[PDB]
Design an enzyme around this catalytic site. Structure first.
Site, PDB file in Angstrom:
ATOM      1  CD  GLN A   1      -2.908   1.003   2.431  1.00 30.48           C
ATOM      2  OE1 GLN A   1      -3.874   1.698   2.142  1.00 30.48           O
ATOM      3  NE2 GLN A   1      -2.723   0.486   3.331  1.00 30.48           N
TER       4      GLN A   1
ATOM      5  CD  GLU B   1      -4.994  -3.488   1.706  1.00 29.21           C
ATOM      6  OE1 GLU B   1      -6.148  -3.851   2.564  1.00 29.21           O
ATOM      7  OE2 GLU B   1      -4.113  -3.375   2.038  1.00 29.21           O
TER       8      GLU B   1
ATOM      9  CB  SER C   1       6.481  -0.202   3.673  1.00 29.38           C
ATOM     10  OG  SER C   1       5.391  -1.103   3.830  1.00 29.38           O
TER      11      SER C   1
ATOM     12  N   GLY D   1       2.206  -6.735   5.531  1.00 31.97           N
ATOM     13  CA  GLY D   1       2.923  -8.080   5.033  1.00 31.97           C
ATOM     14  C   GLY D   1       2.878  -8.652   3.441  1.00 31.97           C
ATOM     15  CB  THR D   2       1.078  -6.192   0.671  1.00 30.19           C
ATOM     16  OG1 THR D   2       1.227  -5.404   0.949  1.00 30.19           O
ATOM     17  CG2 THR D   2      -0.782  -6.916   0.934  1.00 30.19           C
TER      18      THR D   2
ATOM     19  CG  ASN E   1       6.355   7.898   7.253  1.00 30.72           C
ATOM     20  OD1 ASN E   1       5.333   7.041   6.809  1.00 30.72           O
ATOM     21  ND2 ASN E   1       6.503   7.633   6.110  1.00 30.72           N
TER      22      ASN E   1
ATOM     23  CG  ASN F   1       3.169   8.726  -0.643  1.00 27.35           C
ATOM     24  OD1 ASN F   1       3.686   8.669   0.630  1.00 27.35           O
ATOM     25  ND2 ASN F   1       1.623   8.309  -1.112  1.00 27.35           N
TER      26      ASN F   1
ATOM     27  CD  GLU G   1      28.251   5.631 -14.804  1.00 26.15           C
ATOM     28  OE1 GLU G   1      29.215   6.153 -14.293  1.00 26.15           O
ATOM     29  OE2 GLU G   1      29.617   5.498 -15.577  1.00 26.15           O
TER      30      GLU G   1
HETATM   31  N1  LIG Z   1       3.267   7.623   1.438  1.00 23.57           N
HETATM   32  C1  LIG Z   1       3.352   7.369   1.635  1.00 23.57           C
HETATM   33  N2  LIG Z   1       3.083   5.689   2.905  1.00 23.57           N
HETATM   34  C2  LIG Z   1       2.376   4.895   3.867  1.00 23.57           C
HETATM   35  C3  LIG Z   1       1.225   5.579   3.018  1.00 23.57           C
HETATM   36  N3  LIG Z   1       0.161   4.415   3.575  1.00 23.57           N
HETATM   37  C4  LIG Z   1       1.242   3.658   4.539  1.00 23.57           C
HETATM   38  N4  LIG Z   1       2.832   4.230   4.483  1.00 23.57           N
HETATM   39  C5  LIG Z   1       3.711   3.664   4.786  1.00 23.57           C
HETATM   40  O1  LIG Z   1       3.138   2.141   4.917  1.00 23.57           O
HETATM   41  C6  LIG Z   1       3.627   1.696   5.751  1.00 23.57           C
HETATM   42  C7  LIG Z   1       2.849   1.190   6.068  1.00 23.57           C
HETATM   43  O2  LIG Z   1       2.376   0.031   5.089  1.00 23.57           O
HETATM   44  P1  LIG Z   1       1.957  -0.924   4.429  1.00 23.57           P
HETATM   45  O3  LIG Z   1       3.285  -1.393   4.983  1.00 23.57           O
HETATM   46  O4  LIG Z   1       2.392  -0.567   2.550  1.00 23.57           O
HETATM   47  O5  LIG Z   1       0.706  -1.359   4.397  1.00 23.57           O
HETATM   48  P2  LIG Z   1       0.508  -2.915   3.929  1.00 23.57           P
HETATM   49  O6  LIG Z   1       1.787  -3.324   3.286  1.00 23.57           O
HETATM   50  O7  LIG Z   1      -0.686  -3.035   2.679  1.00 23.57           O
HETATM   51  O8  LIG Z   1       0.105  -4.115   4.684  1.00 23.57           O
HETATM   52  P3  LIG Z   1      -0.938  -4.195   5.366  1.00 23.57           P
HETATM   53  O9  LIG Z   1      -1.860  -3.353   6.803  1.00 23.57           O
HETATM   54  O10 LIG Z   1      -1.653  -5.689   5.646  1.00 23.57           O
HETATM   55  O11 LIG Z   1      -2.120  -3.594   4.004  1.00 23.57           O
HETATM   56  C8  LIG Z   1       3.686   2.892   7.144  1.00 23.57           C
HETATM   57  O12 LIG Z   1       4.288   2.416   7.947  1.00 23.57           O
HETATM   58  C9  LIG Z   1       3.927   4.286   5.939  1.00 23.57           C
HETATM   59  O13 LIG Z   1       4.775   4.251   6.976  1.00 23.57           O
HETATM   60  C10 LIG Z   1       0.625   6.151   2.081  1.00 23.57           C
HETATM   61  O14 LIG Z   1      -0.483   6.069   1.944  1.00 23.57           O
HETATM   62  N5  LIG Z   1       1.329   7.075   1.837  1.00 23.57           N
END
Ligand SMILES: Nc1nc2c(ncn2[C@@H]2O[C@H](COP(=O)(O)OP(=O)(O)OP(=O)(O)O)[C@@H](O)[C@H]2O)c(=O)[nH]1
Ligand SMILES: Nc1nc2c(ncn2[C@@H]2O[C@H](COP(=O)(O)OP(=O)(O)OP(=O)(O)O)[C@@H](O)[C@H]2O)c(=O)[nH]1
Ligand SMILES: Nc1nc2c(ncn2[C@@H]2O[C@H](COP(=O)(O)OP(=O)(O)O)[C@@H](O)[C@H]2O)c(=O)[nH]1
Lengths: 435, 428, 373, 49, 434
Positions: A11, A66, A135, A139-140, A201, A223, A249
């Site tokens: 996500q 998801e 990230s 989990g994804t 973040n 972002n 490079e």
């Molecule tokens: N730039 C940006 N970072 C995000 C956003 N949402 C989540 N993050 C970062 O991602 C981390 C958690 O999001 P993810 O790990 O991507 O969530 P996920 O991998 O889909 O995991 P699930 O909750 O199981 O769906 C957080 O600590 C945030 O720093 C977003 O909308 N924009």
């Protein structure tokens, strides 16, 4: 001719890539429907292919386990820019398990994602590499990333692999299972990622508070700066510059040792529209701003460490030898440092295209840098997430989900000594020369 | 006064011959309607080499166009220079070629031979002093292999003192447009060795090599592929049609290029080949032209001349040039690389220079090389046949139409018996 | 897809029966297909051809493809009959006895709209033909004025075609009264080159029913009307040809521009449709002389062309010097001011053909203005 | 999108109201043709005196 | 000059035919009431010419039972087919090989051979037969077997291609498809020269995935098979760069006289609002026929050897980008050939782009059908062999057959013929060791 496929997974990945493709569409041509309205030729053929008439579509695959966050893209403004199965949806979220993102519901998606990577790569003449965006969090973002890189290392081993990583914060964070998932997926992405660029973040929070003059930033604004970082780093192969650089490079000038491949990113002009015209934003000033230890995008103080190699990417109206004055001024300062074994610690590239601003928070400036500093200061954040992992792992907290879901118990330990070796080699390369 | 009878066997040979007749009708000034509009009276001196006159000055080709399926004859007729040919010479047949050497040599092909030899004999008898036949065909596939080699056999039987030229298309290493190229090509070569006098081998990958690296084109068509062959075909027989100094007809080329009677496999070449981007920057001279011929990228068969010794080389220049340039340049080639030329034949190069160039162009040159490097093109097909013949595959058609295992083995044995002297004379 | 069908004849130089064929032009990409009507077989399969244009496709037009020259006689099928059927309209336009000085401007303004040009005469109207022309206003108090204007100077008669060419040429005409055209100022031919409502620039039929009788009176079907106002014996005379090339792309009014701005006196015009045996007689002195006489022949009879007589004025420079050399690319550098220097290209497709040898002058004038209507 | 009623497409809910410019055109790339077929380049047209 | 007949046997054959006619009428510019509209030889391969301007088809619609010829005789295509071409039986064959072959086959077989003769009368060169049927019901199995026997008797020298609708490997539509399929393949091995194999479940999956339709019917299934056979008869239909004949297909597609079951796949199956974002380039449309998802019988090509591959390229196809694509294909290690056939490809170029019927397929410049003979089709044979064993192990449904002219020995004979079949496919699939 000079293309690279972007894989936005997780996500965090799909939002940062949405900012990425928004900035790329506000760059050369392309209206958000997908058509370039005529009013530098080959410039699209790095990030966009070209069908009949013109329907330039991204070389991007958007993967998550998801729905509804791909469905926001498929119902948004850029729904016609993309191709409907570049955006691939699962039906069950990995839900904060490295084990679920990697070990049970990955086989419903890994074959189809690998197949679309293969079709994109066949739709490519000369491939520089894969820019993946994720990230260390959910989990994804962790498990599917690990499985994807486990397959891509076998299938495309010689190609470049650059990671853009949303590292968990030292102090705030958005969940609790960041230590487990981050360490478990770093144990697997250590030996597979050719280079992994990192961003936190809370650091961008501080940057947007102290320089953007916005007190309450949202993740779209978070972002947008990442989109600026990526459109600065993979920019010299879009256009023509005084000093052309590419991903090979970047690797050969940022990575001194095959395990030491974690640079830190830092932008300059993060200035805030009603601030841009009371300074001149000179080359020396923006250079000193990006070596200031207050604009780093990973919350670790660079003075708690030694710089090993830094690259500057000056984009815009930058004469390439005010750069030399700035570098000579920096190398005589006493607050910055470098290792004793690297006399030439600077790689510089210059591009003639000034940064393109989107309607938003940043200012339209004619000069910017992209900083990549490979420092030993990342070991501080590494070790503090290790400390969080030890407090997690003292008496078996949260491990029953992972073991009842399918990963074996000893992987939690094995990730810990893998990160311990990653701790050790940092001071092994940071010690000064004595023999 | 000399005449050459043209034959097109197979689809591939038919389009190659159609582009041939277009190119030489352009050079001799013949319109598609049969009359003459031109600029030089030197073009009509030897129009009775390829064109027979008719009533009203309507010159028709001395060509016989044969195939086993009537879907190439109407294409040739519906070409731009289509109704120049004699409609009685459109010897077609309502059957199927079936890309089968058995069905081209012992079936409907051999049933149509007795009719096509009637018009071949008529075109031979309607001449005062015939010199040669030329046949355009392809080994890979039927008709041009089966009926083509049977035409070679019957015409050699009926006229044993005349030159037999065959422009033959051989399968490529990169692809195969059918699956039975070795099966067709081995039985083709087994007849072609102890028969015809001048085999000129053409390969499609070499054509693409020329059209992409030399000519710099991105979408070449079969018009292009047959056009390079048409230019070569016009430039081999040009000392006989247009005047000049050091004339050389086809039998003189044969006696200066064939040391031993079986060793008559040649790889053609045309070398005023300029891309559109390099035409303005070009420095067209004989010192350029000889180097472009001897550059091993413009050779129109996929064989590397650096892998074997040249036995004999013949060059037919066209244009107003000096024999100082020609003779001493070809001498400096022979001295610049001497290990790639044989020593048992000293001064092993032939020079023939026409005065009249091809239209629009000023200095052209056609290359014909009897070399060792035909051994690669032949051994490749030999191991392809051993691979496809050790398991008896694609064979029931041949055994049903009348072929035999013994004569298949005889064809492979003769291919090996010609793979022997190309190594013997390259290793002395 | 989207093909155009026509029916054509070709005269074969062998056996004299007209070969009847079926032409097919593809406007999506320029491609030619021909079928045979006698035996239902194919002929010149669908092939690209970048010399045939859309304006050449017309009924009775003379079209050259692969030196197998065709003449069109039918509209193919009902589809292209609809597409180029009720479109084409034949109209008779008349240059008045005034504005003959500015004839080239008017020929040019017909040429602007796409009004394709088929017959052209320059005649001094006879006494008997005037009362045939004045049927539109017979027995009203304007016969004396309109007679005195019309039968005063040489008129130029014009056959014109485009879609709904009647009302489109009325739109060029503007108001019938030239004074009304001046007071309105709509940008009409009387608004630029008129004098008054009895001598304006041009007026003819008002409908197709009147266009029929105008056509029959001015261009007859066996031919008696125009007395061929040429003054054949005028000593300082020269006959030149705006070539079927320059007619086909459309340069006639501009040639008239270029030649009248040098003071040379145009005395006669006519368009005649060249045939082969007749081209041989105008180019009789060229076979053996020029080594490419055949291309000159086929360029002459490859379409309609206008003969014209030019009267020698403007001292020192004769018409041979005004046209300069033969090849336009000779003339482009050497004497770079001639009408053959810059009004035409190639050598095959030159602008004009001069009288070459002096004496050989009244001969040509007679050929296309006496011994050929 | 949810219950496809018949042999018609499952059209996306965020895509159904967009203008249907989709069907009635040619999808793919026209071949890039290149310079003409060796008659203009291998012998070139004509040079004049 | 170059004509081939189409014989539609059974329900499945008639529906394949309906799709074929619905394509071909707009392909040749034939209106449904067969006639050119108001506005040279391409018709005279698969349509013959009648007075005024009518173009009557070259087919025999034979069915042992009504209603199926009757939607044709009532619907939009009445005025095109000859009512003497349209042949109906009187009573249903009822999933019975013994009734397609032995008892109600004789009241129709003489009439259908008389009709095939009267169609072949006005044919100067009969290029081949195209038998459209299924390996399922009694009509499509038994009448096809008996018809193939009689046609081998009286037109033995002509090529005879089949387009079989195979039983599903997992779902299946009745309970006696294994019996009928084994019985019909035992008799149609020795006579049919080449049988293209198409099942239903691979079409179901390909229409769900690469055509993005979740619930279309048998009409949308047979439309793709109509596209396939349109790509089969293409070079004797139009003019191209390499005209490849049915005899050309035969002489390069069956390296042994017994192995005659190629699998046919189609590419551009993309779905209209699915093609703004692809190039539909030659390399990727070639790779589509090689990926193991467009394959149109449920078998794994990775679990086998590709023996010969006839690619029919159609449309705006520059004829040597296909050289480039095949050279790229021969290097991939997932598509692996035999060691005794290096030259494994046959190219056929056609210059007429495909015309789309009002329906679901995108309208594109290019189209390829792959005609591949694989050793992996024995894997498809094996499931129906296993089902035949499981039903014959205690004589399931055998009395319905044997009370109807059937003998008990032909079941064992057909099982032994199947034994010879997978023995043939294994010892031709094995590599060279000698
Ligand atoms: N730039 C940006 N970072 C995000 C956003 N949402 C989540 N993050 C970062 O991602 C981390 C958690 O999001 P993810 O790990 O991507 O969530 P996920 O991998 O889909 O995991 P699930 O909750 O199981 O769906 C957080 O600590 C945030 O720093 C977003 O909308 N924009
Ligand atoms: N393409 C296509 N295939 C069909 C259709 N209907 C049936 N099939 C296939 O054909 C098989 C049976 O068809 P037939 O052999 O003709 O059966 P039959 O002898 O006519 O007997 P019934 O169909 O029960 O009346 C089934 O297993 C299906 O897989 C159809 O409408 N279209
Ligand atoms: N040079 C050239 N080669 C061609 C042409 N057309 C086909 N070929 C080659 O001819 C080979 C097959 O020809 P073939 O099947 O034997 O024709 P057939 O004799 O009528 O059966 C192919 O591999 C092509 O490469 C052409 O127009 N020009």
């Amino acid at each position: 001719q000079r293309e690279c496929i972007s894989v936005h997974v997780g996500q965090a990945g799909v939002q940062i890539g949405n900012a990425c493709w928004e900035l790329y569409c506000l760059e050369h041509g392309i209206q958000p429907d997908g058509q370039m309205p005529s009013d530098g030729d080959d410039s699209f053929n790095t990030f966009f292919s070209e069908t009949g008439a013109g329907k330039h579509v991204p070389r991007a695959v958007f993967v998550d386990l998801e729905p509804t966050v791909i469905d926001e893209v498929r119902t948004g403004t850029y729904r016609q820019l993309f191709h409907p199965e570049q955006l691939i949806t699962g039906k069950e979220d990995a839900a904060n398990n490295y084990a679920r993102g990697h070990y049970t519901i990955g086989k419903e998606l890994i074959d189809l994602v690998l197949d679309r990577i293969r079709k994109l790569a066949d739709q490519c003449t000369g491939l520089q590499g894969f820019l993946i965006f994720h990230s260390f969090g959910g989990g994804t973002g962790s498990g599917f990333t690990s499985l994807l890189m486990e397959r891509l290392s076998v299938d495309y081993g010689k190609k470049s692999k650059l990671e853009f990583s949303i590292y968990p914060a030292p102090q705030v964070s958005t969940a609790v299972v960041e230590p487990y998932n981050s360490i478990l997926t770093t144990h697997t992405t250590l030996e597979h990622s050719d280079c992994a660029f990192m961003v936190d973040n809370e650091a961008i929070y501080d940057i947007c508070r102290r320089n953007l003059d916005i007190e309450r930033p949202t993740y779209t604004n978070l972002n947008r700066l990442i989109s600026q970082i990526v459109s600065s780093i993979t920019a010299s192969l879009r256009f023509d510059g005084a000093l052309n650089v590419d991903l090979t490079e970047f690797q050969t000038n940022l990575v001194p040792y095959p395990r030491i491949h974690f640079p830190l990113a830092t932008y300059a002009p993060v200035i805030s529209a009603e601030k841009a015209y009371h300074e001149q934003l000179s080359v020396a000033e923006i250079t000193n701003a990006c070596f200031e230890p207050a604009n780093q995008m990973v919350k670790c103080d660079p003075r708690h460490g030694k710089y090993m190699a830094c690259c500057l990417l000056y984009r815009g109206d930058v004469v390439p030898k005010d750069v030399n004055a700035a570098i000579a001024a920096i190398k005589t300062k006493r607050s910055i440092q470098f290792v004793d074994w690297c006399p030439t610690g600077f790689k510089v590239g210059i591009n003639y295209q000034p940064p393109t601003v989107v309607p938003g928070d940043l200012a339209k400036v004619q000069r910017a840098v992209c900083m990549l500093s490979n420092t030993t200061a990342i070991a501080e954040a590494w070790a503090r997430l290790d400390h969080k992992f030890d407090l997690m792992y003292a008496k078996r907290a949260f491990v029953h989900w992972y073991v009842g879901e399918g990963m074996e118990e000893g992987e939690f330990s094995e990730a810990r000594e893998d990160m311990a070796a990653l701790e050790k080699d940092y001071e092994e390369v940071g010690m000064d020369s004595v023999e | 006064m000399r005449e050459i009878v043209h034959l097109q066997a197979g689809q591939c040979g038919n389009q190659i011959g159609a582009k041939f007749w277009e190119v030489i009708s352009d050079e001799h000034g013949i319109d598609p309607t049969g009359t003459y509009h031109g600029d030089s009276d030197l073009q009509l001196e030897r129009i009775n080499v390829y064109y027979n006159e008719a009533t009203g000055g309507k010159y028709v080709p001395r060509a016989v166009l044969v195939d086993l399926e009537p879907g190439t004859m109407d294409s040739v007729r519906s070409g731009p220079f289509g109704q120049i040919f004699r409609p009685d010479n459109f010897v077609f047949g309502q059957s199927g070629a079936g890309n089968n050497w058995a069905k081209g040599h012992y079936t409907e092909g051999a049933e149509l031979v007795d009719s096509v030899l009637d018009v071949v004999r008529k075109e031979a008898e309607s001449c005062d002093c015939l010199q040669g036949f030329q046949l355009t065909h392809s080994l890979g596939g039927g008709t041009g292999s089966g009926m083509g080699t049977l035409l070679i056999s019957k015409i050699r039987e009926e006229y044993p003192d005349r030159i037999m030229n065959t422009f033959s298309v051989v399968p490529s290493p990169k692809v195969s447009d059918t699956v039975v190229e070795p099966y067709n090509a081995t039985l083709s070569v087994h007849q072609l060795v102890e028969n015809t006098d001048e085999t000129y081998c053409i390969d499609n990958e070499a054509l693409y090599d020329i059209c992409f690296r030399t000519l710099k084109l991105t979408t070449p068509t079969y018009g292009d592929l047959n056009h390079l062959v048409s230019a070569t075909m016009s430039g081999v027989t040009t000392c006989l049609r247009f005047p000049g100094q050091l004339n050389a007809d086809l039998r003189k080329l044969a006696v200066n290029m064939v040391p031993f009677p079986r060793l008559h496999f040649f790889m053609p070449g045309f070398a005023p080949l300029t891309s559109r981007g390099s035409q303005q920057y070009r420095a067209l001279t004989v010192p350029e032209l000889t180097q472009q011929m001897f550059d091993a990228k413009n050779m129109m068969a996929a064989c590397d001349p650096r892998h074997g010794r040249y036995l004999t080389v013949a060059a037919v220049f066209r244009g107003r040039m000096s024999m100082k340039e020609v003779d001493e340049q070809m001498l400096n080639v022979q001295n610049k690389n001497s290990s790639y030329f044989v020593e048992w034949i000293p001064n092993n190069v032939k020079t023939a220079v026409c005065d009249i160039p091809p239209r629009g162009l000023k200095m052209s040159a056609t290359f014909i090389g009897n070399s060792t490097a035909i051994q690669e093109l032949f051994k490749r097909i030999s191991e392809q046949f051993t691979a496809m013949f050790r398991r008896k595959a694609f064979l029931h058609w041949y055994t049903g139409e009348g072929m035999d295992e013994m004569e298949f083995t005889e064809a492979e044995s003769n291919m090996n018996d010609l793979g022997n002297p190309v190594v013997t004379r390259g290793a002395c | 897809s989207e093909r155009f069908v026509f029916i054509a004849e070709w005269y074969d130089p062998n056996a004299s029966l007209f070969r009847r064929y079926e032409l097919l032009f593809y406007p999506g990409d320029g491609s030619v297909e021909m079928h045979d009507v006698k035996n239902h077989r194919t002929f010149l399969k669908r092939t690209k051809y970048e010399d045939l244009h859309l304006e050449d496709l017309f009924i009775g037009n003379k079209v050259n493809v692969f030196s197998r020259q065709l003449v069109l006689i039918d509209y193919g099928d009902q589809y292209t009959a609809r597409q180029l059927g009720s479109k084409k309209e034949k109209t008779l336009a008349l240059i008045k006895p005034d504005a003959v000085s500015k004839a080239g401007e008017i020929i040019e303004i017909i040429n602007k709209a796409g009004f394709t040009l088929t017959k052209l005469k320059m005649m001094t109207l006879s006494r008997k033909e005037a009362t045939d022309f004045h049927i539109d206003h017979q027995s009203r108090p304007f016969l004396n004025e309109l007679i005195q204007f019309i039968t005063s100077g040489p008129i130029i008669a014009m056959e014109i075609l485009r879609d709904d060419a009647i009302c489109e040429w009325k739109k060029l005409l503007g108001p019938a009264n030239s004074g009304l055209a001046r007071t309105d100022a709509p940008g009409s031919i009387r608004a630029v080159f008129g004098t008054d409502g009895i001598r304006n620039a041009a007026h003819g039929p008002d409908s197709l029913s009147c266009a029929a009788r105008e056509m029959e009176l001015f261009f007859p079907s066996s031919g008696v009307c125009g007395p061929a106002n040429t003054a054949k014996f005028t000593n300082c005379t020269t006959c030149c040809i705006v070539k079927p090339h320059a007619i086909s792309e459309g340069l006639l009014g501009k040639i008239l521009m270029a030649i009248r701005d040098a003071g040379f006196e145009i005395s006669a015009m006519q368009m005649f449709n060249m045939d082969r045996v007749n081209v041989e007689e105008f180019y009789e002195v060229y076979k053996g002389v020029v080594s490419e006489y055949n291309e000159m022949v086929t360029e002459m009879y490859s379409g309609p062309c206008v003969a014209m007589e030019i009267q020698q004025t403007n001292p020192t420079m004769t018409f041979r010097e005004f046209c300069g050399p033969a090849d336009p690319e000779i003339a482009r550098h050497l004497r770079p001011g001639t009408l053959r220097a810059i009004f035409g290209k190639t050598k095959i497709q030159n602008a004009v053909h001069c009288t070459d040898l002096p004496e050989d002058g009244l001969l040509e004038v007679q050929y296309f203005f006496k011994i050929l209507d | 999108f949810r219950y496809p009623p018949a042999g018609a497409e499952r059209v996306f809910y965020g895509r159904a109201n967009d203008p249907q410019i989709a069907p009635y055109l040619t999808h793919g790339i026209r071949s890039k043709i290149s310079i003409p077929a060796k008659v203009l380049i291998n012998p070139q047209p004509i040079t004049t005196f």
